[PDB]
Design a protein around this ligand. Structure first.
Ligand SMILES: O=C1NCc2ccc(-c3nc(NC4CCOCC4)ncc3Cl)cc21
Length: 344
């Protein structure tokens, strides 16, 4: 088998001529040449079988991506794994190879307002489909938005995705959370498990802000510092917004803070389109109940040159309610879920 950086990367003979890209916390991503459909492709090595939570996230991701078909969402082209459960130590997911991601682009390139608009349109178009399937991405951030040489955009990394569960969203104050800190909505730190669609809208708002200045808008250094940053721009929550936080610890924390004034969006982003700032304001609304939804965002005047609901598809087959299964049963389900890609 092909070797890369002291790891077997066992994907031949269909897939040859490998180069390293990067690596997540339990597997490496490479590019490779696909000898059947004569193009280079991206391949992710996943090694989840020692741990139940890694099994759960691998299974969820595979199930979601195999169900989804959308121009603004990365698909699965192929899955490679051993012919038997016994021999199966790793799974490789083959996906379209993209040129770059929005994190890399923002570190190097000024975006014109027309690029911002197009990127934001595509993000929201992909997100409309995801949300229409009753799925939350839960880790939207620039590095999970892939781009090609003509600026087509695809959302990737459904490793933290979940089926939406708004009636079980409530939790206590300072409850630990998995998703990337700088893109976390204020309510995660206060009283939310991140099981409602509004969690994703907040992240998109953070992305839009970052496209406007090339800098993250709320770069907290740790859990409660993230809320310090959010409130330093939005200002103190209104009485009405506090009344929706019934949990006393969270409410009393907010009440304990000195008054903070809102920083006007046009002072933070003096070169921005006024319509982009109006949409930004509605995405970065403190109260998740008042936060704009994806379909409203699409219909916003900023996006009027692209908006076309007949060309913003929804999912044919949304998901419903698989968390007490042990890792051995989860291996059998991953083996079952990947069986369509085998020879035979
Ligand atoms: O799902 C994921 N999590 C971690 C990751 C890394 C990379 C990819 C990925 N990258 C690329 N192209 C790179 C090329 C160099 O510039 C950055 C983008 N193309 C397809 C995929 Cl599927 C997907 C994931």
């Amino acid at each position: 088998p092909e070797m890369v950086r002291g790891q077997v990367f066992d994907v031949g003979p269909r897939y040859t001529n490998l180069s390293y890209i990067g690596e997540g916390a339990y597997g490496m991503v490479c590019s490779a040449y696909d000898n059947v459909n004569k193009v280079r492709v991206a391949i992710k090595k996943i090694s989840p079988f020692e741990h139940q939570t890694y099994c759960q996230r691998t299974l969820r991701e595979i199930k979601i991506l195999l169900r989804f078909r959308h121009e603004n969402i990365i698909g699965i082209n192929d899955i490679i794994r051993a012919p038997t459960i016994e021999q199966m130590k790793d799974v490789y997911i083959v996906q379209d190879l993209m040129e770059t991601d929005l994190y890399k682009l923002l570190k190097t390139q000024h975006l014109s307002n027309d690029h911002i608009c197009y990127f934001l349109y595509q993000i929201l178009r992909g997100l409309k489909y995801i949300h229409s399937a009753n799925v939350l991405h839960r880790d939207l951030k620039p590095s999970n938005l892939l781009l090609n040489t003509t600026c087509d955009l695809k959302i990737c990394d459904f490793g933290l995705a979940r089926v939406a569960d708004p009636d079980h969203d409530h939790t206590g104050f300072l409850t630990e959370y998995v998703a990337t800190r700088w893109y976390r909505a204020p309510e995660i730190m206060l009283n939310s498990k991140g099981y409602t669609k509004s969690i994703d809208i907040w992240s998109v708002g953070c992305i839009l802000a970052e496209m406007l200045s090339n800098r993250p808008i709320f770069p907290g250094k740790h859990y409660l510092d993230q809320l310090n940053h959010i409130l330093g721009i939005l200002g103190s929550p209104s009485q009405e917004d506090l009344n929706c936080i019934i949990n006393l610890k969270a409410r009393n924390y907010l009440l304990s803070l000195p008054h903070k004034n809102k920083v006007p969006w046009n002072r933070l982003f003096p070169n921005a389109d006024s319509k982009a700032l109006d949409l930004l304001d509605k995405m970065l609304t403190f109260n998740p109940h008042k936060r704009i939804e994806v379909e409203q965002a699409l219909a916003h005047p900023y996006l009027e040159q692209y908006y076309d609901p007949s060309d913003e598809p929804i999912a044919e087959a949304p998901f419903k309610f698989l968390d007490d299964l042990p890792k051995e049963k989860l291996k059998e389900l991953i083996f079952e879920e990947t069986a369509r890609f085998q020879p035979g």
